[model samples]
Target: QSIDQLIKARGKVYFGVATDQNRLTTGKNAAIIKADFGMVWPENSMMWDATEPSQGNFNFAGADYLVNWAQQNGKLIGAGCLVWHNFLPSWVSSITDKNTLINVMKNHITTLMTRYKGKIRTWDVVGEAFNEDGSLRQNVFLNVIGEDYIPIAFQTARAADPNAKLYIMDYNLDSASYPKTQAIVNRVKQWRAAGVPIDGIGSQMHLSAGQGAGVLQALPLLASAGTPEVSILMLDVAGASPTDYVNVVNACLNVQSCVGITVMGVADPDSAFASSTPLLFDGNFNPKPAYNAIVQDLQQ
Candidate 1:
């Protein structure tokens, strides 16, 4: 059985993969993704630059292509991000006024969520908002609109699609000992207490081989925020190994709040971290040892 089937058997939401139009259109990559994944996260198409390149002008072509394909294939869709410091257009970055930035950010989130609405099951409402030191990263959102930018984003997304799970996704949050991990958990708690409409936490587990223990440690901590879901949003083992894959899958399996895991790519060649062969399938779209390891683990 495929990874998605095995995950479903375990009562998890999905086994997902991050992909783009180019990779999804490629026969080999598309084949692996369709066969193994239950959900799709558009790698770049849903980002700020691609979605709204200009003020009040939007382009949903690339995102629509991916979303429609996911629907056709019976896969769940994740709106990768509605607000991120990176991949932002110059127009958004240059906004010096707080009111202007707030409006732009809200419009962007509302526009995307309204268009896809019920089709998208989850959304990374705001990504990479904190530094490793547990302080806010001085990005455009923070610089202009202050910390309220985050709550504003989630609130807008929630209003636009009441059913979609809104998440704050970030990296370097796979270890309990990491300050950033505690930082995110604390912020999420405060947000919830203040009536923010956030529903989950997304730990982007961009780890190397042998780093799975961190994931085990971190999932429970993330769940402590009282959100309904804690997902491994962008997982990639840089120096890939069978045990590494097994450990990560097992970590999710053991955590009741951990609902899903999304590998960064379908195969090594199509991966953003291709130099390290950091995916479940190899260059030829054949399942690697890591893939087999996950299957075996899920079977247990």
Candidate 2:
């Protein structure tokens, strides 16, 4: 049975996979994806660098493929990182003028989000916008647009796609004592207080085994902040077995506010994380121990 069908029977939480252009339509990998998951986030096709390699000129060739597939198959599509600092083109990265940067960012968010408005259900409105020290990271946006950059991003995205869910995604928030994690939580709280247009917080979930379930438990704070869609994105648990993966799944399943669990890739060779076997399937589209664990868990 497909993980989505099984998990949906057990609870409201859904399972997802992060995939790319070719993988969505090519051979066995594509077959595995259609048969297994319900939500799909383009791993790289929807990022700033790929979409807008040059200013005002957008490329949707890769993302379009996934969106079309999602529409045809009735899958939830997550358009990733409308304005992330990394994966940015050289021109966007070099802009030192505040007005110019703001204008550019607004244009990008509006243009892209508008293009996929009703088709995409959720968007990583702003990706990885914080540092480890519980402070805003220095980037072209933060440098030129200042702290208000986040607010502007959320606002512009809402204007572009009023019905789409908007989220702020970041990594390492799984660490309990990490101030950076707290920083994002606090920002979401503040945004909520001010009636920001944010719908959720994406915990990127780029975690190791030792990181534990701190972030999973802490996600209720996201709901408390008025953004209830606390999605755990990009799961590639390091140095762990399928049982360990089930433990993480169970952790989130325990939390009512935790909404989704996204696997990093379909298989190891196709994974962006090299030399690792963290996914539910191997390169040959064969189920790993994790797949069996998921099936067993849902059957219960």
Candidate 3:
């Protein structure tokens, strides 16, 4: 019942401590995850490597288990990441073409939406789809589908699940002031033009300690997407310590439109923490200062 206090106060607050599927699915880190966090992010579950490891093949066994557990536990779920240059399966690298890659991507998307359907609350449909300049990232998805891959992916997702709230997640756009941030804004606007069914922009708060202030200051640029207003969502705002977390937390609290915040880490017992940030571990499976702060903050 220690976590129950958190469930009561920020209970309705969309603060999900998103974790990877490997941790929860195998129960390898479930104790750690449950000891501190409320939500689950199935690491690479939705990515090409895990989902479609081989061309034209699909697997959702691990991810499905995680989603079902989240629903039963009354916990929110951040959809599996759908895009990224890393985590690509070996089969994918051989495709050598964007259209074929998307052929696999389209199949993967359709299979996931069909399986999970309405159960998913939030999705990172297109993660890091563009570079800092807003131009199409020169990935296999682009080599085949061209820069228009963004709209195609969004459009395909809409067809699969019309009700799911989709997010375009990225690492650099935390600061809306970056020229690259403007590119993201423009990408969002482009999807709207194609009538793509997207809901918001998901900013990965995998950011530095003092960098959060600029993010709050540049909040207005999110409106540049024009016409259909999209939300600015913050996912996985983690830090190595309580003070750093407080800085990120205060920024979210200060921002008017930050709909959600996901904390980043939960270290395993063997960690020195110099190389890891697990709020709920003491290198012996006990909770740490970071974890204590999380529980304490929720108490207030």
Candidate 4:
């Protein structure tokens, strides 16, 4: 079927495949991305470690490929950057001091956003900031820069690309009602109030095996943070098997207020956590059971 036909009817999966630079550069690696998924969210594109790992210097060669591909295909993008550690190169961390980190972030966001301003929208400005219990995660960025660093990231993103949506993303839906989600939602609101150029919150409803339907509860709780314009991102959501995955997808579908959902990882059980959860396709690019499961579900 033609790509146009796939998305002509509001799109089957509002599919956002989690991918990285290496995968995007190769046809073999990007086969699924070019086919099944309609939009792309780089697993490490806007990461601090990947984008500006060395300090002041910026690298766009890898992420630019994803940006160009998305634009050419007319696919919507979940432009990443709320958390920059992934894109950060190893050398960057060697730099000590909070001001250096903030400067690194500022330069990275400016260079990255300026490059893909229009095509990419909806970034996770501060990702996984807090643990499930509402406490801050032990990241050097937070420790050195202080919690206020988030507002600066959002504001810089806004200045670089005024139109794209901004989100504070995380995987704390397990403790949806905890102060963590609340703190993120509140940060978004506070930024909006203070004119820090914030927009929305990203609820990373990344469910794991046997977690059951209760995960849905986080949706509403996350929404309570600010406005109804929130987006649900199911990044690392896992289940025992394909059948289990559909049940997981159905849970998101049932949440009527959710604007969208992004299904992540389609791979073998043994390899799910090996590295990047390998896509559910073989060396020849044939769809595996997990891939078939998504195809079948989307058809329905």
The candidate maximizing TM-score is 1
In model 1, where do residues sit more than 4 Å from their true spots?
none
Screening candidate 2 with a backbone cut-off below 3 angstroms (N, C-alpha, C), the clashing residue pairs are none
Q: Could you arrange the candidates by lDDT from highest to lowest?
A: 1, 2, 3, 4
Report the lDDT tens digits of candidate 2 across residue range 1-300.
798878777775578888877786664767777787888998899989999999999999998988888778777888788888779999998899988999999999998898888888789999888888978888889988898888988999988988898999888777655787778888888887887888888877766654545654555554455576778789886654665677667766776766778888887777666465666777777888878987898786
Question: Whole-model lDDT, candidate 3?
Answer: 0.63
Cα lDDT computed for each candidate against the true fold: 0.89, 0.80, 0.63, 0.61
* Candidate 2 Cα outliers beyond 4 Å, as residue runs: 210-224
- Indicate the worst ten consecutive residues by lDDT in candidate 3: 227-236
139-242: candidate 1 lDDT, tens digit per residue: 99999999999999998998999999999989998888989999999999999999998899999888987788777778888899999888998899987888
Cα-based RMSD of candidate 3: 3.8
- Least well predicted 10-residue stretch by lDDT in candidate 1: 25-34
Cα error, candidate 2, residue 44 (Å)? 1.0
Rank all candidate structures by their TM-score, best first, as comma-separated numbers. 1, 2, 3, 4
Worst 10 residues of 2 by lDDT: 215-224
